[PDB]
Design a protein around this ligand. Structure first.
Ligand SMILES: Nc1nc2c(ncn2[C@@H]2O[C@H](COP(=O)(O)OP(=O)(O)OP(=O)(O)O)[C@@H](O)[C@H]2O)c(=O)[nH]1
Ligand SMILES: [Mg+2]
Lengths: 170, 15
C-alpha cells in the first residue's frame, strides 16, 4: 500500500507528559523542563510492521483554560492517545472525561484509542496498574505503561495506536 | 518536522 497519513492526537491533563512522550518518539530526547503547550504539530515518516507511514501528531493543551479548542481537534483527529500520569490520580479521572468527549463529538462507540499511563520510572504511584487495566478493559482499548524519561513503552504506545487506526479503517 | 502554536513555518526536529 501507499504511505498514508495517520492523524494522531495526544490528550490528557496538564503536566502528564504528553509533550515529553511525543518528543521522545520523534527525536529520542527527554525534556526535563515544563513548557506548557497550547497546540503543537509534529510530522514524521516511520516504518510500522514493515509499512511506511506518515505520523501527523497533534500535541494538545492539558490546561483547562484551552478547553474550547477540543471540539475542533476531536473532529479532525483520527486516533487518540489518552495520557494520564501514574502519580496523579486526578489526571486518571480526567482521562475518562476526555474518552467521553471524544465519543460525543465523533459520535462513535469505537474511535481508535490507547490508554497510556505515563511516568512509570517514578518510585511511587497513586494509580495502580490494576485500576488502569480495569478501565481500558471495560472499554476494549489497549493500555500501555510508559516513561518519557527512560523511553519505556513510548514506541509501543504510538505504534499500537496506528494499528488500532488500521483496523478501524476496515 | 515541528510547528509550534503561532509559528508560520515548520522546522526540522529529526536531523
Ligand atoms: N519522571 C518523569 N517526568 C516526566 C515524564 N514525562 C514528563 N515528565 C515531566 O513532566 C513535566 C511536564 O511534562 P510535559 O510533557 O511538558 O507535560 P504535558 O502533558 O505536555 O503538559 P501541557 O502541555 O501543559 O498539557 C516536565 O517537567 C517533564 O519533564 C516521565 O515519564 N517521567
Ligand atoms: Mg505539552
Amino acid at each position: 500500500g501507499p504511505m498514508t497519513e495517520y492523524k494522531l492526537v495526544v490528550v490528557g491533563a496538564g503536566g502528564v507528559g504528553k509533550s515529553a512522550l511525543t518528543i521522545q518518539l520523534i527525536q529520542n530526547h527527554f525534556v526535563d523542563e515544563y513548557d506548557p503547550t497550547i497546540e503543537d504539530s509534529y510530522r514524521k515518516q516511520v516504518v510500522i510492521d514493515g509499512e511506511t507511514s506518515l505520523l501527523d501528531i497533534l500535541d494538545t493543551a492539558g490546561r483547562e483554560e484551552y478547553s474550547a479548542m477540543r471540539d475542533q481537534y476531536m473532529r479532525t483527529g483520527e486516533g487518540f492517545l489518552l495520557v494520564f500520569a501514574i502519580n496523579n490520580s486526578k489526571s486518571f479521572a480526567d482521562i475518562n472525561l476526555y474518552r467521553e468527549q471524544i465519543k460525543r463529538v465523533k459520535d462513535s462507540d469505537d474511535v481508535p484509542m490507547v490508554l497510556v499511563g505515563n511516568k512509570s520510572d517514578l518510585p511511587t504511584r497513586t494509580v495502580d496498574t490494576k485500576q488502569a487495566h480495569e478501565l481500558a478493559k471495560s472499554y476494549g482499548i489497549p493500555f500501555i505503561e510508559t516513561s518519557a524519561k527512560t523511553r519505556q513503552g513510548v514506541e509501543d504506545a504510538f505504534y499500537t495506536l496506528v494499528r488500532e487506526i488500521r483496523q478501524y479503517r476496515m | 518536522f515541528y510547528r509550534r502554536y503561532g509559528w508560520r513555518y515548520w522546522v526540522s526536529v529529526c536531523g
